[PDB]
Amino acid sequence: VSSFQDILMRMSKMQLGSSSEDLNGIITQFESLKLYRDSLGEAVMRMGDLHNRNGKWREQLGQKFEEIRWLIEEVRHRLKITENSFEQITFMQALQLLLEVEQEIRTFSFQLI
């Protein structure tokens, strides 16, 4: 429902005037994992009709499973400790997008192995 760059900007304005070095780490992971999901779907498109090194290639994809999982836990923790209504909405809009990202990373990686 919320645009990706919209959620980016809302978290960016939160970075100003606040001493949260974990916020840029969350923001840069939020951007990287969203765009990584987009490149996964394009890689499935490039296969055509599903036309894959065991271990190495599967691990490069499997390591991303933990990366998207922990980012969701990071955002959930920041949501649990903030008492500002705007910042809560921002974090929950990020969780809505990241929950879609996690689902599609797993489905695309299943098709790419």
Partner: protein, 155 residues
């Protein structure tokens, strides 16, 4: 471990953009200077996800040889590449990027303008402070919010 650099450098010319993106991201975590020139070549890759990840890696390295190629990346057709180039230019801290970043403050994309201003604050200098006073006096919107915050915190 020292052989992991040469493997990823080769993967920067793989036919699959996903494989090239995995290599650039891994080279940024390693931090080896032997990847500086191969990553600079990747800033002109046909896949924008690879160019952005290459810029992020060059920012982690900190080698000033990537300053000028990152400056040219401020005119990339993708706003995600421009913004990531601003982060890398601010991370290196070379004042040669101050003037391109000031011109980037008039970019059409708003996230690009935020990253251009944020990078200028970290670089610092008298030329940066002059542009911060300009945005604090005549700027509007979120750009004014960042400039006035620069005067409140930095000096």
């Amino acid at each position: 471990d020292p052989e992991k650099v040469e493997m990823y450098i080769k993967n920067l010319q793989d036919d699959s953009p996903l494989v090239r993106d995995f290599a650039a991201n891994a080279l940024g975590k390693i931090g080896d200077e032997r990847a500086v020139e191969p990553l600079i070549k990747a800033l002109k890759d046909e896949d924008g996800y690879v160019r952005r990840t290459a810029a992020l890696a060059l920012g982690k390295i900190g080698d000033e040889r990537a300053v000028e190629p990152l400056i040219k990346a401020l005119k990339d057709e993708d706003w995600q590449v421009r913004a990531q180039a601003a982060d890398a230019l601010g991370q290196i801290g070379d004042e040669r990027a101050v003037e391109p970043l000031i011109k980037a403050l008039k970019d059409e994309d708003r996230y690009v303008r935020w990253r251009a201003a944020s990078a200028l604050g970290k670089i610092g200098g008298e030329r940066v402070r002059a542009a911060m006073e300009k945005l604090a006096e005549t700027g509007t919107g979120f750009a004014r919010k960042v400039a006035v915050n620069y005067l409140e915190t930095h000096k």
